[PDB]
A paper describes a structure:
Interestingly, the [AsnB26]-insulin increased its potency towards IR-B to 142% with a minimum loss of IR-A affinity (83%). This makes AsnB26 a unique single-mutation full-length analogue that is ∼1.7 times more IR-B selective with an overall wild-type-like IR affinity. In contrast, the substitution of TyrB26 by a shorter polar side chain in the AsnB26 mutant results not only in loss of the water-mediated ‘hydrogen bridge’ but also in a repulsive character of this interaction owing to the incorporation of a polar side chain into a hydrophobic environment. The most important feature of these analogues is the occurrence of the B25–B30 bend that detaches this part of the B-chain from the insulin core. It seems that the B24–B25 peptide bond in [AsnB26]- and [GlyB26]-insulins serves as a ‘rotation axis’ for the B25–B30 chain, sweeping it almost 180° away from its wild-type direction. Moreover, the peptide NH of AsnB26 increases the stability of the B26 bend through a hydrogen bond to OD1 of the A-chain C-terminal AsnA21. The side chain of AsnB26 is also near enough (∼3.5 Å) to the CO group of ThrB27 to make another hydrogen bond that would stabilize this region even further. Therefore, the introduction of the Asn residue in the B26 site enhances the stability of the newly formed, bent insulin conformer. Therefore, the structure of [AsnB26]-insulin with the characteristic B26 bend is likely not to be accidental but represents a favourable and stable conformation of this analogue. Moreover, the unexpected but significant IR-B selectivity of the AsnB26 mutant that is correlated with the characteristic bend of the B-chain of the hormone may give the first structural insight into the structural origins of differential insulin signalling through the IR-B and IR-A isoforms.
Residue numbers in the entry:
A (entry chain B): 1 to 28
B (entry chain A): 1 to 21
The structure:
Amino acid sequence: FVNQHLCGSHLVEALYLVCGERGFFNTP
Amino acid sequence: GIVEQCCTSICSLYQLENYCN
């Protein structure tokens, strides 16, 4: 059945999408 | 962390967003 886990490139893609301009894996 | 919450388990939008800068 369909699954809801975000792994690998899917998790990367999800962070690109939801973080937008805020970004992620950065330091200020 | 994020891999155990989102990949092993399932994460909600606000869990995911809180990992953003």
